[PDB]
Amino acid sequence: PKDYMFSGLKDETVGRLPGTVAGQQFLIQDCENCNIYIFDHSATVTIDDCTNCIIFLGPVKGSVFFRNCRDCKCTLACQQFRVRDCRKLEVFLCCATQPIIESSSNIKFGCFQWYYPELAFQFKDAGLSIFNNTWSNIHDFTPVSGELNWSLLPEDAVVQDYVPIPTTEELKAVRVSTEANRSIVPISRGQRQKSSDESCLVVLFAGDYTIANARKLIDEMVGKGFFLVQTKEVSMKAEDAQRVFREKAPDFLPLLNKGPVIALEFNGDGAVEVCQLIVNEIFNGTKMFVSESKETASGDVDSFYNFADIQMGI
Amino acid sequence: EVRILLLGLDNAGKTTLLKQLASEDISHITPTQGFNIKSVQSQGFKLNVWDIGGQRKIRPYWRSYFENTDILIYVIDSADRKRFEETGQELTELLEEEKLSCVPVLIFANKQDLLTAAPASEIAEGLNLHTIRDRVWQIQSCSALTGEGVQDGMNWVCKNV
């Protein structure tokens, strides 16, 4: 009846183990100097009047809403991210939609970076795709001319320095890794400045080994010095395949009704050729789209996001 | 033919409700920056629904939509008790507005699927809805996510067109 809230706690470290929330709403209010770790999926979370807290939130099916919070450091995944009347928040975010802030200042964003064995199924239970993550494209309802109320955390920022893993006996059962190559959510650059104007689109089609294929390709591309810009998971209709893949579409049509496709955008000089070479070796026998050249790649990416934004949009 | 204005605080579930009405995908909804419009068929009527962003910052824009409104639908997040005072103030101010005189109001007590969700009867008492005497009104419990209760509210709407 509401051991689904943390309220009025001070100088404490508290949490919820997998299975103990199970998609219920969770509430956090009037906590100061607290470490809060909810290692389960939830319906929605509101955080009210919290100060100097460290918060991990497992996958949230609906919105996460921070109100009247200051100096909080957070790692969370959600459908919507909302901020009002907050100052000096630092969040490692996975958001299915466009994060918003309002009447807030010094709000910093990084990509979600976290793993534990239960986490993948929690994402599934919350209905959240690990590939639909727009964490860096913030909308500010109250901007101030010639200044910015939000920014992106340093790329070299160390997660343990912001949201350390718990050390209490009560929370030890949850075996956490903050390593980038174990993260359930792949680390995407989103809106970060790029060096290179070379992009590459990869489209993988639904199936039992597709998630693993995507992670392997990311690892290999990152291992060669390339960057994952963004990913997408969206259903493709025949017309969408024809739009993006052009003459290469007939090869992919039988695969569209399998389920949603998974798109990867890579960035860096040589990205297209290298991606082709990796795919040519390690995915022979598995159909997937890869941009033909750097001259057509940006078009591929833009056409993909074009239809994807329309279908996912209101 | 019927102009419906969809209002309520930010995060109440207005757009989720908008998509539920349109019989469209409910699982992926972005916060609304400006407004959305959709036309829906119900009981022989064509309902033009204006779904407006509800952030405190953009509530002054609400008045730009009042003219020719046939029905007001006001959405409350029943599981956000922290903001019951805020939503009460906004509703009270809305019903004082000259351009919305006599306009029937359906209050949707949304997110009833959630644990801390206050029942409609509790919300009606706390917001003193019985004192609304200048118009017809109804409170309807719902979950925009599942769709349950939504049709029941819309039946009242079509009755009071």
Ligand SMILES: Nc1nc2c(ncn2[C@@H]2O[C@H](COP(=O)(O)OP(=O)(O)O)[C@@H](O)[C@H]2O)c(=O)[nH]1
């Ligand atoms: N559990 C639950 N969540 C809901 C319901 N209606 C809306 N939501 C969620 O609440 C959040 C805000 O909804 P949204 O439609 O964007 O609110 P709006 O600003 O009023 O348009 C979203 O994450 C929705 O998925 C409901 O009935 N139940």
Ligand code: ALF
């Ligand atoms: F996302 Al809103 F009112 F907060 F549409």
Ligand SMILES: [Mg+2]
């Ligand atoms: Mg909306």
